[PDB]
Amino acid sequence: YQRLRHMVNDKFQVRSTGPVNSLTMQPVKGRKRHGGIRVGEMERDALIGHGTSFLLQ
Amino acid sequence: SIPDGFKKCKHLKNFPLNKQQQVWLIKFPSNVDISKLFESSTTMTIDKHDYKIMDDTDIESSLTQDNLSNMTLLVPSESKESLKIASTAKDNAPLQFDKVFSVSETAKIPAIDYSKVRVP
Amino acid sequence: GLLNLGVKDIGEKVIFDGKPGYLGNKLSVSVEQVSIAKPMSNDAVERKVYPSESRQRLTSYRGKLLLKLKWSVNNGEENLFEVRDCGGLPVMLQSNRCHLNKMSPYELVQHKEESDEIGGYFIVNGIEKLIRMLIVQRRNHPMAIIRPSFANRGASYSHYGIQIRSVRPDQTSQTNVLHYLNDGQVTFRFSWRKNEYLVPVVMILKALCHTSDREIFDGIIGNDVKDSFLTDRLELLLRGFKKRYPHLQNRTQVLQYLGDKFRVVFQASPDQSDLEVGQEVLDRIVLVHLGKDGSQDKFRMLLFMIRKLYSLVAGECSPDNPDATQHQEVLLGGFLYGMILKEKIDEYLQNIIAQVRMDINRGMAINFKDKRYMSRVLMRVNENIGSKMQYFLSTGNLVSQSGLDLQQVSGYTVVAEKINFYRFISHFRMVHRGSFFAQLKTTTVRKLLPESWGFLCPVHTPDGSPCGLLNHFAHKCRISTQQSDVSRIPSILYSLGVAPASHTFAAGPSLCCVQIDGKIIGWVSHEQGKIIADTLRYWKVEGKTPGLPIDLEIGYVPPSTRGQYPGLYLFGGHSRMLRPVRYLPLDKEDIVGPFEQVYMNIAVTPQEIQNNVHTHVEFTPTNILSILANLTPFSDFNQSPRNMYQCQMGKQTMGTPGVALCHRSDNKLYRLQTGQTPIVKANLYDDYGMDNFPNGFNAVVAVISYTGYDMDDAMIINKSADERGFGYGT
Amino acid sequence: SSRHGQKGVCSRKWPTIDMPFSETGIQPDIIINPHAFPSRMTIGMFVESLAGKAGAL
Amino acid sequence: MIVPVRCFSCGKVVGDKWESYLNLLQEDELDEGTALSRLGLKRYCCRRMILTHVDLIEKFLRYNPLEKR
Amino acid sequence: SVVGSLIFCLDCGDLLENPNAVLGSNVECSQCKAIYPKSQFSNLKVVTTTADDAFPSSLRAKKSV
Amino acid sequence: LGIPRLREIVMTASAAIKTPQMTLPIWNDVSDEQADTFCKSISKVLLSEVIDKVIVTETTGARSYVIHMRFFDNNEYSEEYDVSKEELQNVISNQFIHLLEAAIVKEIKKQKRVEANNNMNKVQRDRQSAIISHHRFITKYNFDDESGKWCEFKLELAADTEKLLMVNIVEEICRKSIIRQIPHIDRCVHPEPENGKRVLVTEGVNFQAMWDQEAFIDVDGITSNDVAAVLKTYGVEAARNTIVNEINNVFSRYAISVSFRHLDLIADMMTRQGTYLAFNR
Amino acid sequence: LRLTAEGNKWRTDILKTSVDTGREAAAEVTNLDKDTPADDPELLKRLQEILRDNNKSGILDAVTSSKVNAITSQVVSKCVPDGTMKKFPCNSMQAMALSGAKGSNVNVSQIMCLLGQQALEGRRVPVMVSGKTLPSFKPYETDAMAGGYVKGRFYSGIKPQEYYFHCMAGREGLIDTAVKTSRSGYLQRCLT
Amino acid sequence: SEIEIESVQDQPSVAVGSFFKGFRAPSDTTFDLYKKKKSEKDEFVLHGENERLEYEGYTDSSSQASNQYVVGLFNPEKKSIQLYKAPVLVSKVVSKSSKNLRGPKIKS
RNA sequence: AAUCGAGAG
DNA sequence: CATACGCCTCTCTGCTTATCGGTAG
DNA sequence: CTACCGATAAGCAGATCTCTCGATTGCGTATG
Ligand SMILES: [Zn+2]
Ligand SMILES: [Zn+2]
């Protein structure tokens, strides 16, 4: 049995607040910079299909 | 022209021709000596080596055909100081030989040992 | 080596000065020898530099690049030879120009490297790099290609052609294309610098050698004069050339026109007759694999290429697969280093000539025969070729000047990651089809052709985007890196029954043309060609005849009904793929190649041999895999996607990368504190000696559904075992 | 991951008192599901298990 | 890199057995199974632990940062 | 020299131009400056046939079997 | 089938549909052999279908070109293609020679930049004279009307023209020239009936053509593969029916049953302006 | 994953019909007389023409594939479930195949009985220009095993030629899935 | 039959040359040969000329070191075969009316 | 911050 | 020899555009 | 006669999920 190098200490990430991009004032990109996770176009479209409007907003 | 290190040999020897005699071309490799000594794909044994005798009689396969070739029989005239062509009439065209042969070195791959190679 | 041939073929860069049909006071700079000193340090007498150096201190393991540039004035008047350094060129490990070339494991342990360390990687800026081995077209082989993209070149541009590469003896290649036009003429095509030019083929044919036009007729239409397709096409070609170039009556005139056309693109000096620059373009563009003095050769080669193009048009042959292994070779990585160094030194010569031209424009000092003037001019230019090459290795991008027949630009050096020993070994066997095909849509390049039997491991290929594009080599795949002794091969092929190239009026698919290294030798029939091929292998595998090298593969293609174009194609060059195999008559280790084997009956194991069918038997069926594919236990009892997943996983295994981790400074390394040998190991776990880097442990696995915490793909470890050191690592 | 592409994240450190045991008195240190085998069709894993037990014994 | 104190699966100490195993294997023509039998290891969980230890600490020690080489 | 639609020079082996474009009884070699009468080239009879795959049909296939 | 078909229907709305077909119900009071006869009567036949080999004899001594075309067995090709000697004669006399003549003259314009008898009959000679008068640089013509096995037509040009292939042009003209074609139809195969309801399906769509033929086809029930064709010849609603049927059909090869409401919503959203609209910019 | 003696006997016989199966498929496709020896020059010529022509190659592959699929179906029906030494519900592999927990009857059948014909795209296997399917197989060979039809099973392992064919098919599957992942993205985003 | 060679000849007495298919020469023209010395191989260089033709020629560079070409005749009534030695030369006939067609060395 | 390279589902 | 300032090549849809003639003022 | 226009094959503009790491960044010449 081989122990792979994709350990869970290198994969988890959480942000409450933190740095923001200066020209958009949106959360930064990346884990090592303590940024956010992107809810993309497809996720937005999924949120529209449910009808959960305030979730989308 | 005239090349450095080359001599124009002005003394050659005659090449006679006149039921009548016929001329052939024979090609040999450089590993057979020619000092010591009608058919298709013959063979002969010399220098304990397998010798192949292929007669690649091109053009002349279809009887006489047009008889156009890519080589000439260069002959001495009655001066023996240059190279000239010869024929049988006033055709002023090259006269290819009546046959041609080629010799090729031959080996013999030993027949494979099926019994000793098909080990279960 | 190759770096003397490269500077030899670079030539000389001529320039005249601006004060006196007196052209000026000539200058001709060049290089005749390039010296690569082994890496040393200036801390007097230069001590030896060891690769643990520049790795401990986060630097580069670069040697010194010094070249003997000349400064000749006018044809041996006052030649001012002078060597001068050009900055520290990065050099790899375990190569001759490195201080571990011929050492022992004991002293290797002493030198703080590793116990059985291997190189292949250049240490640039404290990071190990690696020149990936790309896979390119077979050199010196005219392969008929059908591409609808050849139709895009304009109207009357049929989508047929004949593409051939040709590599210079310094390992640099110039490719050629022979497009076929619907009107009837065929236009030779080539590229120079970073631009493309097209030329009618007959002008090239008469430029190469001075002979009659009837010779072209016989060299394309050999003995099929009773045919009509070829005769009509050739008449179109010849009459079109005559009516489009009415005043090119002889070779001198055609070369004169070629030189006039190609004068400023090549930056020819004013002391360049048109008859001279035409010859220079001719000898440095067309069929470069034949080199100079072989114009009489390139003539017959181009005639054969035209005839094969006609056969491709007429449906007498088949469009050879360019993405099948039968028509591929691999550039060796160090040869990319050689090509880029040669282009850099060429550009350095161009830059010093530019500096002299700036001197003419402003400074106006013409003392060419003054070494003080030479010192003044030379010290102005950028000489750090070593810095340029270090940039190249560290960034992967290629700022070249002529492309060197490479389809891509970026992505040539990858990082030799030392996450795991399996990853490390994996790097030095992978083959990349090129960054060109990564951006694409057609799957047919990603297929698994049967031509790659025992060359590219069918299992080892990373799933995802690079699937089929990054296929590793079989662990018993040898890549020839030396030219073979072919100079005596014609000497024996003639006596075997081959009429040589000259005085041979015969062409077409009906006869077998014998070609070595892309050079035509003679023409023989098909049955006799088969006999000759088998006789050659018979004499070759037994090493009695010194003139038949082991690596010489003899590709023989029998006559076929509209199959592949025939011709006994021999090869002895570099860059090829080779595989050992047995030869059933008088068994002995025989070396085969991808082009060669597609007509050989190679039984997988000796038990499935048949009467007069098979002639070769593989040593072991396990040799078609890579190392990481032979390491998977009981592979024949798994689904192939699972084998591929295993090969991808073992390259991501957290285990011991090495034991010299004391004397390294890599950014991030994972090691397993306690590793175990596998009980269920392959036989090659000991041939390659992988006991030094245990990647895991022998775990008691229970195939049981008991906890519920492992259904889709999860698994459960023992808490106590985990607490007794199971799989621990830092 | 096994050497047959049977990758899988560790889902719980099962305490040895809760692990199954045999007559010999050993809790296996790795538990994997049998349902991973039908779709994946890796008999190599089964024969490796057999060979490993035989070789260690 | 070095022999573990306790067997993972069970807990039977196999760390006082590596030198004994090597001595039993080299002094006599003892097979690995016989040596593991004579060493107090009868279950395969213990047997594989000493049958399959690499002892990479030997290769590790040969790079001493406190000794002239 | 004479082959199908084209005639080569007998001396220098170069392609003689097309007789129709030149004055009668005189066709000139571009290289040898020689002269050939036009009455030795009476019929440039050349035969041609298609490639037997140029015309796929549902009826040739039945002929094949 | 698959995503290609799906995106063709919805993403592009291509009227140049890659594979168009039309389903033609046939009358219950017809026989299978008569059905095959009608299928071969409708299906397209090109000139090249009935030419074993065409021989060109380039003679320059003015630059004559005897083009002798060999025809297949009459008893075979007549009953394979439903083509007769008279119809082939008309085709050669009208379409083929004129296409070839236009090709020859265009190529020259761009260039600058068995036995027989000496006289078949007087009516044949008058046909030959008519041919020579009608065409520009033709000089002979004769087509065997008693066996349908050959047809020659001598041809010449001037002396300023260069060499011409007279083979590739003949072949391409021959392939283009049609003998008996229903426009926008290139075959009419007889598929084995599925779920009853015998159907004759073609390689093209031309509703006007079969509208005339009611003796065999149940013209009231022709349903075709195309969408633009059915839209402009039957209406927006027939087009929407065709859209729903095609979109469900591709989902129906893999049995991925999607609701008949999503598909109809897609169809009516992409026909919301009275035309076949796609989903793109 | 095992069978019984009688099951193995049935499997072996119905499998060893495949020699004549493949030869007859080839002979019928080439429209030559049935039961003709494979070394027939006319058969070889027709097979070469079929190899050169794409549509002819497709027709031959479809016919031979149908025949060998018939043989595979016969083997599977006669063996599973009537041959396994361990039977449902004891046979846990067969139990999870029947119950839909994981896998399928096809998976069980190719583990225990026969792996079956390998489908490259809609064809059997690409053939090299010399007519060989692999280095070992003779050119233009009339044989199911040459034409990608593997007679092995994952229980008793697969021979190297069949291993190569199976690797080809598995890689093709992986590439097709990689393309199909992104093929629908643009369609769905444009619709939505 | 199985016919041997009666007499073997070594001195240059004949030659074989390949101009191109369908080539002729008149009675006037003659060919002059040369033989190289100090070189192991027996190279030949052919010289021929007339008012406007030059039957120039040079022998092989990579063939004569490996194979040979030999001329001879056979007796129709007897078994005697004469033998002669001939070297193969490749002749590239270039006329005298175009050798000097040259333009400017450099076009201004 | 972009480019290149390695990978994950 | 440091420091400082700018010049340089293998997809598919759908709308840019055709050469020419038909034909009523 | 010719303009109005109605229709005939080619050039170009714009297409073809989320994530975590690491490495590196074009040069030539002018003044002090
Ligand atoms: Zn234990
Ligand atoms: Zn001439």
* Six token digits for residue E57: 């600490």
Mutation site, I18, I23, I92, I96, interface F, largest F CB count within 10 A: I23
CA distance G163 to chain C (A): 7
E68 in reach of chain C (CB within 8 A): no
Helix (H, G, I), strand (E, B) or coil at I86: coil
Please tell me the distance from the alpha carbon of residue C678 to that of residue C663, in angstroms, as a whole number: 29
CA-CA-CA-CA torsion for H151, H155, H156, H161, nearest 10 degrees? 50
If you write DSSP's letter for every residue of C130-197 in order, what string do you get? EE-EEEEEPBT--EE---GGGTTT-TTB-S--EEEB-EETTTEE--EEEEEBSSS-EEEEEEETTEEE
Q: Is G81 exposed, middle or buried (0-12, 13-18, 19+ CB in 10 A)?
A: buried
Helix (H, G, I), strand (E, B) or coil at C619: coil
In a shared domain, residues C182 and C161: yes
d(CA C420, ligand 1 centre) in Å: 28
Q: Which residue is associated with the tokens 């693109």? A: C265
Q: Helix H18-29 and helix H41-52: axis angle, to 10°?
A: 70
CA atoms within 13 A on the CB side of G128: 18
In a shared domain, residues C569 and C588: no
Query: What is the chain C residue with the closest CA to E61?
Result: C659
Helix (H, G, I), strand (E, B) or coil at C653: strand
Q: How many helices (H) and strands (E) does chain G have?
A: 11, 10
In sequence order, which ranges of chain H are alpha helices (DSSP H)?
5-16, 18-29, 41-52, 54-79, 92-98, 105-112, 160-191
Dihedral pair phi/psi, residue I17, rounded to 5°: -130, 145
CB C113 within 8 A of CB C664: no
In a shared domain, residues C510 and C523: yes
Give contacts of F32 with chain I, Cβ < 8 Å.
52-53, 95, 97
* Six token digits for residue A27: 């959360």
CB F28 within 8 A of CB G19: no
Instruction: Tell me: cis bond preceding H81? Omega within 30 of 0 counts.
Output: yes
C235 in reach of chain F (CB within 8 A): yes
Q: Which residue is associated with the tokens 């010192």? A: C375
Strands (DSSP E) contained in C38-142 are: 40-41, 47-48, 64-72, 82-85, 123-124, 127-131, 133-137
Q: How far is CA F11 from CA F33, H174, I26, I27, in A?
A: 11, 67, 10, 14
Which one, of C160, C164, C166, lies nearest residue C146 by Cα?
C160
Which one, of H153, H160, H104, H107, lies nearest residue H3 by Cα?
H153
Strands (DSSP E) contained in chain I are: 16-18, 31-36, 44-48, 57-59, 67-74, 81-85, 88-91
Name, in order, each residue with C-beta under 8 angstroms of H63's C-beta and a sequence gap of 6 or more: H25, H28, H29
Please tell me the distance from the alpha carbon of residue H86 to that of residue H155, in angstroms, as a whole number: 14
In a shared domain, residues C146 and C275: yes
Q: Which residue is associated with the tokens 């290089």? A: C31
* Six token digits for residue C309: 């193009």
β pairing state of C512-516 and C167-168: unpaired
CB G47 within 8 A of CB G69: no
User: Which ligand approaches the C-alpha of residue F14 most closely?
Assistant: 2
Q: Which CATH superfamily is domain H1-159 in?
A: RNA polymerase Rpb1 funnel domain (1.10.132.30)
In sequence order, which ranges of C542-614 are alpha helices (DSSP H)?
594-597
* Six token digits for residue C110: 């002493």
CB C127 within 8 A of CB C100: no
Q: Helix G262-269 and helix G236-251: axis angle, to 10°?
A: 140
Q: How many CB atoms lie within 10 A of CB C351?
A: 14
β pairing state of C64-72 and C82-85: antiparallel
Q: How many CB atoms lie within 10 A of CB C543?
A: 11
| Angstrom distance, A33 CA to K4 C1' | 36
β pairing state of C431-432 and C133-137: parallel
CB C160 within 8 A of CB C150: yes
β pairing state of G142-143 and G178-180: unpaired
Which one, of H136, B82, B32, C369, lies nearest residue I32 by Cα?
B82
β pairing state of C499-500 and C512-516: unpaired
E37 in reach of chain D (CB within 8 A): no
Angular region, G134: left φ>0, alpha ψ -120 to 50, beta rest: alpha
Please tell me the distance from the alpha carbon of residue C295 to that of residue C207, in angstroms, as a whole number: 9
F31 in reach of chain C (CB within 8 A): yes
Instruction: Tell me: cis bond preceding G20? Omega within 30 of 0 counts.
Output: no
Name, in order, each residue with C-beta under 8 angstroms of C116's C-beta and a sequence gap of 6 or more: C105, C108, C689, C692
CB C474 within 8 A of CB C624: yes
Q: Determine whether the interchain pair D26/E48 forms a contact, defined as Cβ–Cβ distance below 8 Å.
A: no
Host H or E run for residue G152: strand G150-152
Name, in order, each residue with C-beta under 8 angstroms of G29's C-beta and a sequence gap of 6 or more: none
Q: Determine whether the interchain pair E45/D57 forms a contact, defined as Cβ–Cβ distance below 8 Å.
A: no
Q: Which residue is associated with the tokens 């592999």? A: H93
Q: State how far Cα I5 lies from the chain centre.
A: 23
Please tell me the distance from the alpha carbon of residue C323 to that of residue C327, in angstroms, as a whole number: 7
Please tell me the distance from the alpha carbon of residue C230 to that of residue F48, in angstroms, as a whole number: 11
If you write DSSP's letter for every residue of A1-57 in order, what string do you get? -B-BS--GGGT----SS--B-TTT--BPB-TTTT-B----HHHHHHHHHTT-HHHH-
DSSP β-bridge partners for residue G51 = G71
Which residue range(s) make up the domain with C5?
1-119+333-406
Dihedral pair phi/psi, residue G205, rounded to 5°: -130, 115
Q: In this structure, which amino acid lies at residue I8? A: V
DSSP β-bridge partners for residue G150 = G70
Name, in order, each residue with C-beta under 8 angstroms of C303's C-beta and a sequence gap of 6 or more: C205, C216, C219, C220, C507
Name, in order, each residue with C-beta under 8 angstroms of C223's C-beta and a sequence gap of 6 or more: B58, C505, C506, C507, C508, C510
Please tell me the distance from the alpha carbon of residue H138 to that of residue B28, in angstroms, as a whole number: 38
CB C663 within 8 A of CB D26: no
Does residue C127 approach strand L to less than 7 Å at its CB?
yes
Please tell me the distance from the alpha carbon of residue C286 to that of residue C428, in angstroms, as a whole number: 34
Does residue A47 approach strand J to less than 7 Å at its CB?
no
In a shared domain, residues C315 and C385: no
Residues 432-461 in C having a C-beta less than 7 A from any atom of strand J are 435
Please tell me the distance from the alpha carbon of residue C232 to that of residue F5, in angstroms, as a whole number: 8
Name, in order, each residue with C-beta under 8 angstroms of C127's C-beta and a sequence gap of 6 or more: C394, C415, C667
Q: Is C296 exposed, middle or buried (0-12, 13-18, 19+ CB in 10 A)?
A: middle
In a shared domain, residues C310 and C366: no
Ion ligand 2 contact residues with beta carbon within 5 A = F 9, 11-12, 14, 29, 31-32
Please tell me the distance from the alpha carbon of residue D3 to that of residue C650, in angstroms, as a whole number: 8
The full length of chain A comes to 57
Does residue C724 approach strand L to less than 7 Å at its CB?
no
**Backbone discontinuities in chain C, residue before each (C to N > 2.5 A):** 20, 43
Q: Determine whether the interchain pair G3/H187 forms a contact, defined as Cβ–Cβ distance below 8 Å.
A: yes
Give contacts of C249 with chain I, Cβ < 8 Å.
98, 101
CB C430 within 8 A of CB C470: yes
Q: How far is CA B33 from CA B46, I2, I10, in A?
A: 10, 18, 12
Q: In this structure, which amino acid lies at residue G74? A: N
Q: Which residues of F are annotated as a binding site for Zn(2+)?
A: 9, 12, 29, 32
CATH number, domain with residue C525: 3.90.1070.20
Nearest to B19 among I14, I64, I76 (CB): I76
Q: Do chains G and A touch (3 or more CB pairs under 8 A)?
A: no
Specify the nucleotide whose C1' lies closest to residue G8 (CA): K13
Q: Determine whether the interchain pair F4/C214 forms a contact, defined as Cβ–Cβ distance below 8 Å.
A: no
Which one, of H86, H60, H78, lies nearest residue H10 by Cα?
H78
User: Which ligand approaches the C-alpha of residue C212 most closely?
Assistant: 2
Please tell me the distance from the alpha carbon of residue C190 to that of residue C195, in angstroms, as a whole number: 9
Host H or E run for residue C226: none
In a shared domain, residues C149 and C282: yes
CA distance H98 to chain G (A): 21
Helix (H, G, I), strand (E, B) or coil at C691: coil
CB I42 within 8 A of CB I57: no
- Rg, Å, chain E Cα set: 14
* Six token digits for residue H74: 């016969």
Which one, of A14, H156, H166, G205, lies nearest residue C459 by Cα?
H166
* Six token digits for residue C32: 């005749």
Please tell me the distance from the alpha carbon of residue C621 to that of residue C606, in angstroms, as a whole number: 10
Name, in order, each residue with C-beta under 8 angstroms of G79's C-beta and a sequence gap of 6 or more: none
E3 in reach of chain C (CB within 8 A): no
Please tell me the distance from the alpha carbon of residue E48 to that of residue E36, in angstroms, as a whole number: 9
Please tell me the distance from the alpha carbon of residue C325 to that of residue C451, in angstroms, as a whole number: 6
Q: Nominal resolution in Å?
A: 3.4
Please tell me the distance from the alpha carbon of residue C382 to that of residue C352, in angstroms, as a whole number: 9
Q: How far is CA C515 from CA C50, C221, I59, in A?
A: 46, 19, 21
Give contacts of C458 with chain H, Cβ < 8 Å.
163-164, 167-168, 171
Dihedral pair phi/psi, residue G48, rounded to 5°: -65, -20
Please tell me the distance from the alpha carbon of residue C526 to that of residue C547, in angstroms, as a whole number: 24
- Rg, Å, chain H Cα set: 19
Q: In this structure, which amino acid lies at residue C91? A: V
In sequence order, which ranges of E2-54 are alpha helices (DSSP H)?
18-27, 32-38, 44-51
Dihedral pair phi/psi, residue C178, rounded to 5°: -115, 85
C560 in reach of chain H (CB within 8 A): yes
Name, in order, each residue with C-beta under 8 angstroms of H139's C-beta and a sequence gap of 6 or more: H130, H131, H132
DSSP F17: P
DSSP C676: B
Q: Report how many domains make up chain I.
A: 1
CA distance G162 to chain F (A): 9
Please tell me the distance from the alpha carbon of residue H153 to that of residue H162, in angstroms, as a whole number: 10
CATH of E1-66, one of 3.40.50.300, 3.30.530.20, 1.10.40.50, 1.10.10.60: 1.10.10.60
Q: Is C629 exposed, middle or buried (0-12, 13-18, 19+ CB in 10 A)?
A: buried
Residue E10 annotated as binding? Answer: yes
Name, in order, each residue with C-beta under 8 angstroms of A48's C-beta and a sequence gap of 6 or more: A56
Nearest to E54 among C694, C725, C726 (CB): C694
Q: Which residue is associated with the tokens 């270090």? A: C390
Please tell me the distance from the alpha carbon of residue C645 to that of residue F40, in angstroms, as a whole number: 78
E7 in reach of chain C (CB within 8 A): yes
E1 in reach of chain C (CB within 8 A): yes
CA atoms within 13 A on the CB side of C103: 23
Q: How many CB atoms lie within 10 A of CB C127?
A: 18
CB C382 within 8 A of CB C324: no
Q: How was this structure determined?
A: cryo-EM
Q: Which residues of F are annotated as a binding site?
A: 9, 12, 29, 32
In a shared domain, residues C145 and C83: no
Q: Which stretches of chain C sit within 8 Å of chain G by CB?
A: 182, 184, 229, 232, 235-236, 239, 243
Give the angle C72-C77-C81 at the CA atoms, nearest 5°: 35
Does residue C214 approach strand L to less than 7 Å at its CB?
no
Sign of the dihedral through C-alpha G40, G46, G47, G48: negative
Helix (H, G, I), strand (E, B) or coil at C298: helix
* Six token digits for residue C101: 């070339």
Which one, of H164, H168, H125, D38, lies nearest residue C636 by Cα?
H164
Helix (H, G, I), strand (E, B) or coil at G183: coil
Give contacts of F7 with chain I, Cβ < 8 Å.
none
CA-CA-CA-CA torsion for C307, C309, C313, C315, nearest 10 degrees? 70
DSSP β-bridge partners for residue C577 = C479
Does residue C410 approach strand J to less than 7 Å at its CB?
yes
CB C618 within 8 A of CB C605: yes
* Six token digits for residue C28: 């001709």
CB C516 within 8 A of CB C507: no
Name, in order, each residue with C-beta under 8 angstroms of G75's C-beta and a sequence gap of 6 or more: none
Give contacts of C315 with chain F, Cβ < 8 Å.
51, 53
Name, in order, each residue with C-beta under 8 angstroms of C11's C-beta and a sequence gap of 6 or more: C30
Q: In this structure, which amino acid lies at residue G260? A: F
Does residue C322 approach strand K to less than 7 Å at its CB?
yes
Please tell me the distance from the alpha carbon of residue C706 to that of residue D33, in angstroms, as a whole number: 8
Please tell me the distance from the alpha carbon of residue C471 to that of residue C130, in angstroms, as a whole number: 17
Q: Looking at chain I from residue 42 to 81, which residues have their Cβ under 8 Å from any Cβ of chain C?
A: 60, 62-63, 65-67
Please tell me the distance from the alpha carbon of residue H132 to that of residue C560, in angstroms, as a whole number: 13
DSSP C324: S
Nucleotide L26: closest residue by CA–C1': C399
Q: How many CB atoms lie within 10 A of CB G45?
A: 23
Q: Which nucleotides of K are covered by protein (CB under 7 A)?
A: 1, 9-14
In a shared domain, residues C310 and C418: no
Sign of the dihedral through C-alpha C672, C677, C680, C682: positive
- Interface C–G counts its CB contacts (< 8 A) at 12
